[model samples]
Target chain A: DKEFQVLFVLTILTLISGTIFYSTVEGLRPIDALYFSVVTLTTVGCDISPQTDFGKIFTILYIFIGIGLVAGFIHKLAVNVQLPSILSNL
Target chain B: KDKEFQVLFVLTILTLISGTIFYSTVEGLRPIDALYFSVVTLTTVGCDISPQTDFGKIFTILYIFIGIGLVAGFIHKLAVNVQLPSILSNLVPR
Candidate 1:
């Protein structure tokens, strides 16, 4: 569906936005920032955390913003892609 | 606008506080750890900070199901408030 496509694009943009923001603001390497952004937004918390207070705060805010978008995309995935295939098997 | 944001923020904050308190008491986690775990679980980006006890595990399942929608709504509200572009809303016809 078009809705899924929009969400898909938005999710990617959010990840890129977070990656760039963290890279510039937190001064983390681009790869690390991308990794952290994915991990945090996906709720995959690891030992790594932001070294700076601003980064930490941003991470919390970003989680609230990005997680919803990610969830929406995943929901679409379930309905549009996964569910039909799953039903086929059953 | 203000009313929606305020209520949503309050609800989200209350949920976080409740989770923090419960986790801290039941799991013997410090406040920060409890809060972090709560956020992590609700977002479903699950990491290693898992609950060991039966109660904690049960509570977590309940928390995830309940709070997931709440957090998602809160985030959607936030994105609306911030006026973040809806991924080229005009360009992408739905």
Candidate 2:
């Protein structure tokens, strides 16, 4: 049961670290960095991408890691944050 | 078990339709592109497209937060339904 909390923390830290890496490399604004981080993890295909070769390589790496954890992360977030509120409502 | 799967499948499709419509209107994207982008945003591929309008951008942000929770809650409910059967069956004399 409490393992849910650990998984949740892992997701948050990865996203934050991901945001920092992207922001520094791309010179993106904080919001845009966050935007890119979430979109990169959750989305499958689109028009925009990293212009630099290094950034592109990083993206490939990001995709690998993001794929493994993002769903689990989002799932737990739905639990810890959304579930309690929902139960209260019921 | 079947109902659990049905509810999960239905909710996934619902969000897809909703996201497609919202992105299509706000971004002036063609229907196909809108549908594709909606899926992209939901999954966050970070590939080719992005919001052109402030409305689209804001909607994208809000959708990520709300949509994830909505889908997650639905899935958990489904899990419980699946588990309860096995859970109760165990308590009875076989």
Candidate 3:
């Protein structure tokens, strides 16, 4: 359980890092960039405001990478959720 | 079941309210625009359209908090409860 939780935290950290990088590189404010990163990575595509072509490109790349991470993370979590039972029997 | 649905309904309402307020104040968009923006933000399939000001960025920041909180909370709850269908619906609502 602890390891599984750590995985979640690590995922969040990755998100934050990607967000900060995107914001700094794209010339957006830190908070704004972080916000965009969270929204994009989570796949919540709300049209709350306008974006630059650069921002859009950043988002597209971020989403592609994020989706893969999410898929893998979910799979890992699934395996861990079953591990306890398997271990108890062993 | 009714209580669960009620909770879900409340969560949905909260999400909409958060989105509307964020977009309206930050972007100075009309109520309709704000609501639409919130919908788009929450669903995360962002259309090419957007607000074109610093204010829009602020609104975006706020909207992201709401989106992440709701989505993550929903997923965490589903994982704890072992309700895969419920989580799936929240992510890909029908």
Candidate 4:
């Protein structure tokens, strides 16, 4: 539970950092910034694009760095933890 | 085309349900927006009103984390399935 919380915060921070990078440097709309963050974090690669070269580069790091974070999050959530109460209906 | 995808498909569907159940309970969002959030949340969210409640935010956070896990796990499974034949085929005498 505790470590998941840490991971959650880290994910949020990473998202914010990514958000600002795309929003300011690349000039994506703020909502679109969030959208891109979600798109990458979700790993739905085809759903969106980073239009600029800077954005394209950032995206590679976005995904490459994230693979392990994702693997870590899933390891704890599925392999180690219980289904959060919301999922208990199953 | 293979059975791996069928199983992966189910995982995606199940993850979709989990996301739908989640977003609906927390916020009264339009179906499309909610699905957007669900996939965004599931795959992964930073859209619409977002969740004002910390509980809801944390919920969204973890729910999507779990979701992406399901997707990644299945994709890995499917990837291995796709490769195994070729991997094994290589073992055969040429």
Residue-level lDDT of model 1, residues B1-94, one tens digit each, is 5787788778888989999998999999877767767777776666566788999999998998888877767777776765345545566556
Top candidate, metric TM-score: 1
Whole-model Cα lDDT per candidate? 0.78, 0.68, 0.61, 0.65
Which regions in candidate 3 have their CA more than 4 angstroms from the true location?
A: A1-8, A23-27, A45-64, A68-90, B49-62, B65-94
| DockQ scores of all models, one per candidate | 0.39, 0.27, 0.21, 0.14
**Candidate 2 runs further than 4 Å off:** A43-46, A52-57, A75-90, B30-33, B40-47, B61-94
lDDT per residue (tens digit) for residues A1-90 in model 4: 699778767777877887798899778666567556755666543345777898899888888876567567665665343334224433
The value of fnat for model 3 is 0.42
Model 2: per-residue Cα lDDT over B2-92, one tens digit each = 4445545566678879887887787887878888876655544433667866567667866775566556556566567766777888899
Error of 1 at A39 (Å): 3.3
The sequence of per-residue lDDT tens digits that candidate 2 reaches over residues A1-90 is 777777667767877877797789878766676667766776534356787888899889987887568777666655565545445544
Which pairs, if any, clash in model 1? A42-B45, A43-B45, A43-B46, A44-B45
TM-score of 1: 0.60
Docking class of 1: acceptable
For every model shown, the clashing-pair count is 4, 13, 11, 3
